[PDB]
Design a protein around this nucleic acid. Structure first.
Lengths: 16, 90
DNA sequence: CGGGTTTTTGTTAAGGGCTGTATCACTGTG
DNA sequence: CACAGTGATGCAAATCAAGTGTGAAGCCAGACAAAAACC
DNA sequence: CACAGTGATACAGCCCTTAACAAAAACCCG
DNA sequence: GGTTTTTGTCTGGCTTCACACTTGATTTGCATCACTGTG
C-alpha cells in the first residue's frame, strides 16, 4: 500500500 | 404490551433499546473518530438541538461542558443594581 | 515543485422560528 | 390595630480550607429470570 | 440642539433542513 | 396461554463521591432602628 496523503483528522470537538 | 415513553423509563430499563445501537456507535467512533463516545454523542446532540431550534439549551450544554461561567462579579452586580434604578430591598 | 488525495468551509434558493433593534408620540427636572 | 419599604449595623448560623486513609455508591462486562398490560 | 426612558409593533439578521457543487488548506511521492 | 415490556439478579473490577477527626477563617442570613407615602 502507498500513502495518498490528506489533511489530518482533528478531534471531533475541534471542528466547526 | 405496547411500549411507553422513553423518558419515563428508568435507568436500567432503557439499555435494551440502546444495546443494538451503541455497538455501531462505538465501532464508528473507533474506526473514524478514534474511540471517544461521549464526545461524538455531544456533537450529535448539539447538532440535533440546533436543528430542533433549541439554541438556548445548546448554549447551556456548551457552557456546562466547557468552563463554568456561572456567577457574576460583585462589581457588575453593583453596576446593575445602581444603573437599573433598583433599591436594596428589591 | 506540483498533481493527487483527503479534509475544511462555504455557496446557491425556498421556507420557519427565534432574537435584536428602529419607530411612534410623549414624560420629567426645570 | 397598613403595609411595603429604607439602607447601614451587628451578631448568629452556615460553609469551608488543611492533612490521608477508609466507607458507600454507581456502573461496566454478557447472561438468566420473574411481574404486568393488551390480545 | 437634554437626555435617558416607555412600551407595543413590525421588519431585518441569524440560523436549521433539503443536495449538489465550488473554493481552499495539509501530507505523499514522482 | 402469547407477546412484549419492565424490572430484578448474578461476581470481579473500575471509577466517583462522602466522611472521620480536629481549628480556625471566613461568607451569609436576618432582626433592629426610627421614619416615608396614599388619605
Amino acid at each position: 500500500h502507498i500513502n495518498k496523503g490528506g489533511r489530518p483528522r482533528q478531534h471531533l470537538l475541534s471542528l466547526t | 404490551r405496547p411500549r411507553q415513553h422513553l423518558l419515563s423509563l428508568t435507568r436500567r430499563a432503557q439499555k435494551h433499546r440502546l444495546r443494538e445501537l451503541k455497538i455501531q456507535v462505538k465501532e464508528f467512533a473507533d474506526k473514524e473518530e478514534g474511540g471517544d463516545v461521549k464526545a461524538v454523542c455531544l456533537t450529535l446532540f448539539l447538532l440535533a438541538l440546533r436543528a430542533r431550534n433549541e439554541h438556548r439549551q445548546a448554549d447551556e450544554l456548551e457552557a456546562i461542558m466547557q468552563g463554568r461561567g456561572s456567577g457574576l462579579q460583585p462589581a457588575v452586580c453593583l453596576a446593575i443594581r445602581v444603573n437599573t434604578f433598583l433599591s436594596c430591598s428589591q
